[PDB]
């Protein structure tokens, strides 16, 4: 079994340097034709190829990120490192390391190159956020008028935050949205609940643990 | 660089269906193309390598064909683990390009969104900011489009959207759009409008409020 795992910091500030490590087992980067590559994925977006390094120390980078990337390997410690200089908030994404098979050999001879046409095993991925921002609790605002309703959970950092309605008793008709990272470096989020116009009290239960901020907000029409 | 376009971008389907996703390249990539399946919160899983080879441990219902500039992925009988996003990758040229992805969701009846506009709380206005939120509730398909207008001016660059994951019982999506302005700015206008364009709507629906109207 081949396994890879990414490691590094969950948070980095703009202009700073990001160092990611990929630790693997089940293969060596001394093995013929083998590669280890990095691919990232911004929240809600598509896969973007970043770089690759082979057992012969051959290296390739994304032409668009080339001046900020350095890829390197430590064959003895089964690790591959990616260093990204001067990051911005757009570098925020999940970062993956992956294995690339080398050609099939028969008595040391290369007989098939078909298996190198894919990245066959991937690591679970490491999530990295880029904010110049510091730990901060949310301001909770009401979202008042099937009838709709909710509590805007604004300007907190970092993720995550928990939201419940009526201390856990209201679950039906509830929608807690994914938070967006604002240009300010802070997240914002909303939780709404639709009900029978006609209705009962509604309270947004909010908890941002990083900041130790707990808020209960009754919302009326 | 190399352009790798996936079609369609989103695909509606049910368990047992046969589906096909295609991936088109701007130049021949020979047989150097891979297909992956990515379920939410997990990394991509390899299904097909070298355009048509089935990867070890991958179910036989997955199949890949084509070479050159046209590639297709076929799932003969859709299983529930298949409701996910698919990707193609090219490895014939550097850099190793990825497609935009093809989302495969659970099919259901078209449902128009319930729209709702929320004006900012006076509590927040007191802090110097104004957030206007538009809610698009329980719709299908997933594609929707929000357009903010302030005193009929079209807003651009001051909003952020968020979409939920398909509901496990509804098979619907919900979207949130937040228009953010300074309080100064906000008090310089009257009509805040959220225009919604969706497939289950004959025409765009607009929800609004006049700031001040009490």
């Amino acid at each position: 079994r081949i396994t890879l795992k990414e490691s590094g910091p969950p948070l980095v500030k703009p202009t700073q340097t990001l160092t990611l490590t990929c630790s693997f087992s089940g293969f060596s980067l001394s093995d013929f034709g083998v590669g280890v590559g990095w691919i990232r994925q911004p929240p809600g977006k598509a896969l973007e190829w970043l770089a690759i390094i082979y057992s012969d120390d051959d290296k390739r980078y994304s032409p668009s990120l080339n001046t900020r990337l350095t890829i390197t390997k430590d064959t003895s410690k089964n690790q591959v490192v990616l260093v990204m200089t001067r990051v911005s908030p757009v570098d925020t994404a999940t970062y993956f390391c992956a294995h690339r098979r080398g050609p099939t050999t028969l008595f040391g001879v290369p007989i098939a190159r078909g298996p190198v046409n894919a990245m066959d095993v991937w690591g679970q991925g490491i999530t990295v956020t880029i904010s110049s921002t510091s730990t901060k609790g949310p301001s909770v605002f009401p979202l008042a008028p099937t009838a709709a309703l909710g509590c805007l959970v604004k300007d907190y950092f970092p993720e995550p935050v928990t939201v419940s309605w009526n201390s856990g008793a209201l679950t039906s008709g509830v929608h807690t949205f994914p938070a967006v990272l604002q240009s300010s470096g802070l997240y914002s989020l909303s939780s709404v609940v639709t009900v029978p116009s006609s209705s009962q009290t509604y309270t947004c239960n909010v908890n941002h643990k990083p900041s130790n901020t707990k808020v209960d907000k009754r919302v009326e029409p | 660089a190399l352009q790798l376009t996936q079609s369609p971008s989103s695909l509606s389907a049910s368990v047992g269906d046969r589906i096909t996703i295609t991936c088109r390249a701007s130049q021949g990539v020979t047989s150097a193309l891979a297909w992956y399946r990515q379920k939410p919160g997990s990394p991509p899983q390899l299904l097909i390598y070298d355009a048509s080879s089935l990867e070890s441990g991958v179910p036989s219902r997955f199949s890949g064909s084509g070479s050159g500039t046209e590639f297709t992925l076929t799932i003969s009988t859709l299983r529930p683990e298949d409701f996910a996003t698919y990707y193609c990758q090219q490895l014939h040229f550097y850099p190793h390009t990825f497609g935009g992805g093809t989302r495969v969701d659970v099919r259901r009846t078209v449902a128009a969104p319930s729209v709702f506009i929320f004006p900012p709380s006076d509590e927040q206005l007191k802090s110097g900011t104004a957030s206007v939120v538009c809610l698009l509730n329980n719709f299908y398909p997933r594609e929707a489009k929000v357009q903010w207008k302030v005193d009929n001016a079209l807003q651009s660059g001051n909003s952020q959207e968020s979409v939920t994951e398909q509901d496990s019982k509804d098979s619907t999506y919900s979207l949130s759009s937040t228009l953010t302005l300074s309080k100064a700015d906000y008090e310089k206008h009257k009509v805040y409008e959220c225009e919604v364009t969706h497939q289950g709507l004959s025409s765009p629906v607009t929800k609004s409020f006049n700031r001040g109207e009490c």
Binding site: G33, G35, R60, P110 | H92, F93, Y94, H96
Partner: peptide
């Protein structure tokens, strides 16, 4: 620029 294994 072609891939590493293109000329094998």
């Amino acid at each position: 620029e072609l891939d590493k294994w293109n000329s094998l």
